[PDB]
Design an enzyme around this catalytic site. Structure first.
Site, PDB file in Angstrom:
ATOM      1  N   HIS A 157      34.485  12.567 -16.642  1.00 54.60           N
ATOM      2  CA  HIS A 157      33.277  12.219 -17.392  1.00 54.60           C
ATOM      3  C   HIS A 157      33.601  11.916 -18.845  1.00 54.60           C
ATOM      4  CE1 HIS A 157      33.007  16.552 -18.695  1.00 54.60           C
ATOM      5  NE2 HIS A 157      32.484  16.021 -19.782  1.00 54.60           N
ATOM      6  N   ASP A 190      35.427  15.931 -10.900  1.00 57.20           N
ATOM      7  CA  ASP A 190      35.426  15.550 -12.305  1.00 57.20           C
ATOM      8  C   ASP A 190      36.847  15.634 -12.850  1.00 57.20           C
ATOM      9  OD1 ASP A 190      34.583  14.810 -14.759  1.00 57.20           O
ATOM     10  OD2 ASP A 190      33.479  16.635 -15.260  1.00 57.20           O
ATOM     11  N   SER A 207      34.763  19.424 -23.384  1.00 61.22           N
ATOM     12  CA  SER A 207      34.882  18.711 -22.140  1.00 61.22           C
ATOM     13  C   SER A 207      36.286  18.138 -21.929  1.00 61.22           C
ATOM     14  CB  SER A 207      33.939  17.486 -22.093  1.00 61.22           C
ATOM     15  OG  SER A 207      32.642  17.819 -21.704  1.00 61.22           O
TER      16      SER A 207
HETATM   17  N1  LIG Z   1      30.293  24.903 -20.508  1.00 69.21           N
HETATM   18  C1  LIG Z   1      29.247  24.174 -20.980  1.00 69.21           C
HETATM   19  N2  LIG Z   1      28.220  24.931 -21.371  1.00 69.21           N
HETATM   20  C2  LIG Z   1      29.312  22.749 -21.017  1.00 69.21           C
HETATM   21  C3  LIG Z   1      28.218  22.019 -21.505  1.00 69.21           C
HETATM   22  C4  LIG Z   1      28.279  20.626 -21.552  1.00 69.21           C
HETATM   23  C5  LIG Z   1      29.419  19.938 -21.125  1.00 69.21           C
HETATM   24  C6  LIG Z   1      29.448  18.440 -21.117  1.00 69.21           C
HETATM   25  C7  LIG Z   1      29.089  17.734 -19.785  1.00 69.21           C
HETATM   26  C8  LIG Z   1      27.657  18.056 -19.305  1.00 69.21           C
HETATM   27  O1  LIG Z   1      27.292  19.193 -18.909  1.00 69.21           O
HETATM   28  N3  LIG Z   1      27.073  16.869 -18.922  1.00 69.21           N
HETATM   29  C9  LIG Z   1      25.723  16.883 -18.272  1.00 69.21           C
HETATM   30  C10 LIG Z   1      25.710  16.919 -16.750  1.00 69.21           C
HETATM   31  C11 LIG Z   1      25.936  18.108 -15.987  1.00 69.21           C
HETATM   32  C12 LIG Z   1      25.912  18.151 -14.572  1.00 69.21           C
HETATM   33  C13 LIG Z   1      25.678  16.920 -13.947  1.00 69.21           C
HETATM   34  C14 LIG Z   1      25.448  15.729 -14.666  1.00 69.21           C
HETATM   35  C15 LIG Z   1      25.460  15.706 -16.075  1.00 69.21           C
HETATM   36  O2  LIG Z   1      25.211  14.630 -13.824  1.00 69.21           O
HETATM   37  C16 LIG Z   1      25.308  15.224 -12.506  1.00 69.21           C
HETATM   38  O3  LIG Z   1      25.604  16.660 -12.600  1.00 69.21           O
HETATM   39  C17 LIG Z   1      27.823  15.705 -19.307  1.00 69.21           C
HETATM   40  C18 LIG Z   1      27.642  14.424 -18.497  1.00 69.21           C
HETATM   41  C19 LIG Z   1      28.733  13.431 -18.807  1.00 69.21           C
HETATM   42  C20 LIG Z   1      27.996  14.160 -17.485  1.00 69.21           C
HETATM   43  C21 LIG Z   1      28.931  16.260 -20.264  1.00 69.21           C
HETATM   44  C22 LIG Z   1      28.406  16.396 -21.723  1.00 69.21           C
HETATM   45  C23 LIG Z   1      29.440  15.687 -22.641  1.00 69.21           C
HETATM   46  C24 LIG Z   1      29.190  16.406 -23.955  1.00 69.21           C
HETATM   47  C25 LIG Z   1      29.020  17.890 -23.533  1.00 69.21           C
HETATM   48  N4  LIG Z   1      28.511  17.852 -22.127  1.00 69.21           N
HETATM   49  C26 LIG Z   1      30.506  20.678 -20.636  1.00 69.21           C
HETATM   50  C27 LIG Z   1      30.456  22.061 -20.587  1.00 69.21           C
END
Ligand SMILES: N=C(N)c1ccc([C@H]2[C@H]3C(=O)N(Cc4ccc5c(c4)OCO5)[C@H](C4CC4)[C@H]3[C@@H]3CCCN32)cc1
Lengths: 27, 10, 251
Positions: C43, C99, C199
């Site tokens: 991602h 992922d 991430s």
């Molecule tokens: N530890 C954690 N609390 C944690 C929180 C958030 C993230 C990531 C990631 C995050 O949780 N999402 C949201 C998400 C989450 C689950 C999903 C999604 C989207 O689509 C289908 O299933 C992101 C999307 C690119 C997919 C990504 C985002 C990028 C900036 C920070 N975010 C990382 C870690």
């Protein structure tokens, strides 16, 4: 091979300040 | 925010 | 990283910063698994709902770093991407299943006191360490809070792996065998989570059998950061190791 062995810690037999926490949780 | 890096890398 | 602490120098020498060229910004965490290969979350590179689709030339990897913003002259190494490999069944439509992505560097990076690769687990490592209650370690330059904000240097937090039922019951998202969750429960009193900018970074564990660090996870998703009743979710590296080996053996 050398992997996972840190120059400033495992290679020199020094521990970092919280790896013990991990070890203690390994049962 | 980020310090600029040596041009060679850009 | 929320409610973590400053890293020690050389504590995480496999730590990799994915850096955007223009605008020059932190894109994600990542990890060094050999002198030419870097592992991160798919991602971080591909997410069409947000029109994210980074090309090789869009970014750099910065290895050996401690300070987030500074150019660490004579310590860090900056590397160019030769090729990006994303998992062909990475499910960005539904739940970020699988992922994971690989990045091949144009040239080998020199190992040093600050730059060194982490191990990838084999089946028995996974079986032995990927246990509810066992603690792993997450590192990154991500936010210090869900909404003080950004760290001056690399942050570290240790977190216990959580039982799969608890993981599943904490979210409406469909959880897969290619995922695990980690974090403290409200009842445990302690805190800590990964967050925005963390991430793609590694979840590592130190084997007590051979004293080596293994990356069991990749920071993949979560809901908020360090929320009571929610857990960070992690790509299960060993489960996708077949794909990893296939890529590196082929390219
Ligand atoms: N530890 C954690 N609390 C944690 C929180 C958030 C993230 C990531 C990631 C995050 O949780 N999402 C949201 C998400 C989450 C689950 C999903 C999604 C989207 O689509 C289908 O299933 C992101 C999307 C690119 C997919 C990504 C985002 C990028 C900036 C920070 N975010 C990382 C870690």
């Amino acid at each position: 091979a050398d992997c996972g062995l840190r120059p400033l810690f495992e290679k020199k037999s020094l521990e970092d300040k919280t790896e013990r926490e991990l070890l203690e949780s390994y049962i | 925010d980020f310090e600029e890096i040596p041009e060679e890398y850009l | 990283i929320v409610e973590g602490s400053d890293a020690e120098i050389g504590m995480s020498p496999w730590q990799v910063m994915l850096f955007r060229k223009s605008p020059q910004e932190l894109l994600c965490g990542a990890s060094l698994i050999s002198d030419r290969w870097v592992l991160t979350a798919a991602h971080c590179l591909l997410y069409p709902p947000w029109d994210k689709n980074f090309t090789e030339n869009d970014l750099l990897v910065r290895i050996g770093k401690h300070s987030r913003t500074r150019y660490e002259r004579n310590i860090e190494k900056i590397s160019m991407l030769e090729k990006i490999y994303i998992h062909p069944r990475y499910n960005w439509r539904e739940n970020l299943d699988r992922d994971i992505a690989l990045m091949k560097l144009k040239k080998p990076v020199a190992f040093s006191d600050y730059i060194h690769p982490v191990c990838l687990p084999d089946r028995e490592t996974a079986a032995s360490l990927l246990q509810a209650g066992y603690k792993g370690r997450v590192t990154g330059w991500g936010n210090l809070k869900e909404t003080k904000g950004q760290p001056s240097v690399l942050q570290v937090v240790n977190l216990p792996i959580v039982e799969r039922p608890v993981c599943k019951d904490s979210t409406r998202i469909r959880i897969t065998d290619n995922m695990f969750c980690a974090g403290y429960k409200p009842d445990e009193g302690k805190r800590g989570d990964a967050c925005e900018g963390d991430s793609g970074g590694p979840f590592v564990m130190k084997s007590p059998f051979n004293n080596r660090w293994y990356q069991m996870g990749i920071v993949s998703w979560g809901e908020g950061c360090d929320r009571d009743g929610k857990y960070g979710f992690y790509t299960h590296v060993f489960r996708l190791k077949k794909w990893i080996q296939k890529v590196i053996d082929q390219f």
